[PDB]
From Swiss-Prot, chain A:
GO terms for biological process: cytoplasmic translation; ribosomal large subunit assembly. It comes from the Bacteria. Pfam families: Ribosomal_L3 (PF00297). The modification N5-methylglutamine is found at residue 150. The lineage of its organism: Bacteria, Pseudomonadati, Pseudomonadota, Gammaproteobacteria, Enterobacterales. This is Large ribosomal subunit protein uL3.
UniProtKB/Swiss-Prot annotation, chain B:
PANTHER family: 60S/50S RIBOSOMAL PROTEIN L6/L9, LARGE RIBOSOMAL SUBUNIT PROTEIN UL6M. This protein binds directly to at least 2 domains of the 23S ribosomal RNA, thus is important in its secondary structure. It is located near the subunit interface in the base of the L7/L12 stalk, and near the tRNA binding site of the peptidyltransferase center. The keyword RNA-binding applies. This is Large ribosomal subunit protein uL6. GO terms for biological process: cytoplasmic translation; response to antibiotic; ribosomal large subunit assembly.
UniProtKB/Swiss-Prot annotation, chain C:
GO terms for cellular component: cytoplasm; cytosol; cytosolic large ribosomal subunit. Belongs to the bacterial ribosomal protein bL20 family. Keywords: Ribonucleoprotein, Ribosomal protein, RNA-binding, rRNA-binding. GO terms for biological process: cytoplasmic translation; ribosomal large subunit assembly. This is Large ribosomal subunit protein bL20. Part of the 50S ribosomal subunit. Contacts L21. The keyword Protein transport does not apply.
Curated annotation (Swiss-Prot), chain D:
This is Large ribosomal subunit protein bL36A. It holds the Pfam family Ribosomal_L36. Keywords: Ribonucleoprotein, Ribosomal protein, RNA-binding, rRNA-binding. The lineage of its organism: Bacteria, Pseudomonadati, Pseudomonadota, Gammaproteobacteria, Enterobacterales. One of its GO terms (molecular function) is rRNA binding.
Amino acid sequence: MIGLVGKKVGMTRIFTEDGVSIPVTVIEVEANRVTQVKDLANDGYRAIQVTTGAKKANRVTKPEAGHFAKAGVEAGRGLWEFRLAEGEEFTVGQSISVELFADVKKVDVTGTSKGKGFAGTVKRWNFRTQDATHGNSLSHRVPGSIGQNQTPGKVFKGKKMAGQMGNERVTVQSLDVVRVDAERNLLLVKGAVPGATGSDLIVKPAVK
Amino acid sequence: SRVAKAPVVVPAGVDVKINGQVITIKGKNGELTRTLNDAVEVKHADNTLTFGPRDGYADGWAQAGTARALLNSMVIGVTEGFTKKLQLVGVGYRAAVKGNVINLSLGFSHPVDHQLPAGITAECPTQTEIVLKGADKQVIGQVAADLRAYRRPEPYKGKGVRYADEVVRTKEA
Amino acid sequence: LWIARINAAARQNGISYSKFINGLKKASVEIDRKILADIAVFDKVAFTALVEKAKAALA
Amino acid sequence: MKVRASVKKLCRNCKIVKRDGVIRVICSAEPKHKQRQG
Amino acid sequence: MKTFTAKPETVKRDWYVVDATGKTLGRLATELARRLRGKHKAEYTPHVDTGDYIIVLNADKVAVTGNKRTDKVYYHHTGHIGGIKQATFEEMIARRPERVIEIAVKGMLPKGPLGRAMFRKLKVYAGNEHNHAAQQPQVLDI
RNA sequence: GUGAAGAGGGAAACAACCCAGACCGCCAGCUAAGGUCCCAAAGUCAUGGUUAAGUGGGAAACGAUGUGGGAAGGCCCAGACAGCCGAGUCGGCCUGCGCGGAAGAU
RNA sequence: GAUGUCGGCUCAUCACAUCCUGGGGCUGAAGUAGGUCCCAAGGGUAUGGCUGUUCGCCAUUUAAAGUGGUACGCGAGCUGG
RNA sequence: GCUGAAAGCAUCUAAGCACGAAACUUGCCCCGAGAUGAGUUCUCCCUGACCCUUUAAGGGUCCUGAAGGAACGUUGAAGAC
């Protein structure tokens, strides 16, 4: 089925009455508001679009204001879509809350990872370092050979080298749902999820 | 050729319909339809069907023979029918029938169930016998082979699922 | 280039290049490929007349 | 089964067949007489 | 006088429609290529385009002889080491039926900018319905 | 005999192979070797046969009821060959075209 | 009127005549374990003592410690026994 | 393996039908319309007068300057620029 959009708050622990500590991640999941319903006769596929959050009125351009005003909702801090299955239906203006996950056991979480900038082969691809003594000359953390010889006489596409690391989309799968709280808008999952404190997350029911 | 040069008689009470290359045969035991290869001519005079080659094809006679055999089998099946018998040998081996499912215990660690297709009936006189009744020779044979394949006979004692009139050889270690 | 244009022109009237040239040889016409192509493009009634003469010769 | 470039009849109960472009020998008495040309 | 040469600013072109049910692939592709290039007009000029527009219907029903439905293999390479890939005629008809005729015709045209420009006048559909009735095409029996 | 000291056409690309020996100009015609479905000039020519392997478009000793043509043998309505009545069947020789043997590194 | 070469280190890529894992036929295949052949290239395929050594012998592990091509791969990437 | 003739028998095959592996196509994750074959959907903004000539997807004078963007400043768990 569909999922929701939340924000990353931090990490803590839960003690159990039988003497166990569970490391959990705290996600704040406010209400999600339906802005558009896309169907098969006019668009070609079945999906819904949702918004969440709040945004100041002096930073909202006129096209965005019109798009929100046609639906009849206030402005949020983004727009996302979720594909619909066979037998699911929603209406424009409707609100969806965290209690959708009341009976779910496991979830999949998607986010954006922390950035590291330019990185080398030791850090990016786990290459092994050469000797530190015994006569080495300016070649300690360098990669080494990158090809064979006259045959083929080039470097193959996809070779592992240095460059940008981090700051991209990452999914993590099959995480237990430790707690759902509706009066507070809280979801506590077990483990860790990609991103930093104060970032947008997408939470879905497990696919496997 | 020598097989296609013998007409097939239609006993009283059997209806035959011919439309292009499609043939339908109906009678007391039921209904059977088929489509023939595009090299044969079939003619119905008063009480018999005759098969022959068309023109412009290089393998008419073999196809005619095959078609003759097929229609003879259909004619027999639409009135009398066909039967198959299966036997079980071993210790702790048995079979039972409910509705259209045969449950077999054959020395495994899990149950084995087999779901019959449409048009075949099954029964068990004793715990160690199966009888299959039907109107289609090919389907009855396929079901018998399927049932056999679960636990084939072995050459040191003979345990397994076998045919009624099959001789199974044995050798010594 | 001239030969290709002549082939195209003759196939619309209903004959092929080789047969057309054979018919002209048997009828004793002595026009060449340059003039033939020029006429095929700029005047079509005369080309039909030539094709008819070649067909009569072949028949 | 025997994979050989020379396939023959070894006893009187053997038969030679052509299946799917391949020549084979099948015996109804001895399982050791089964041959395939390849 | 000098020999005649055609001019792209004044050239006539026409729209034709063809059906491909039960027809041999290569013996259809030859005619398509010939009429796309324009070898059927007395104004043929090697350095100009003089052809016509052709619509092709029912591309999922071409015919091949022999055992080619299962034994004809299409190859390609992805540019990465080890990236050789293949498909069969049946699989092509099941996934992308138009690509078959398109490849056949593309192999039979001149190589260069002008051949690429000639290829753009070919419309191939998998069904029996086009949406080009505003151009009024004429039926062509090949 | 050719190249060296020789250009032009064919063999995909290819000094020594096949055709053929360039004084200069032409928006004329006939041919050689090799070719005429599209890339690319010219027969989707006419008559009679063979191959089903994409053989054509890589290769042996040897093995096989693949399929055309030819000349002779044994048995056969005095009921033959296969199986439990009714028209043929059995084994060799010469010859045309195909099948298997057939595994390599961007 | 110059194409630096044995072993080691770092980094690889291909073939199949398959070392392990997968699917099968025969067995002088009772079971557990084996022998021989057919299909199959997705992934994975040791640390040390001696010697400059590739190899090799030895000690203790592992499901297994495959055979070959790439200027006997790789010094404008390192070392220099 | 089932049914079945050429070859009155037999036969997994020639006409029909069913199973069958980490190899093949999908199912999982990431990029992706410069896909020049440049795609689809929702929202927003612009509604004045004249002259010339070789007469057409023509050149020029006054009035007007929207949606939005960019530049500057205080900065970031984003970054060699």
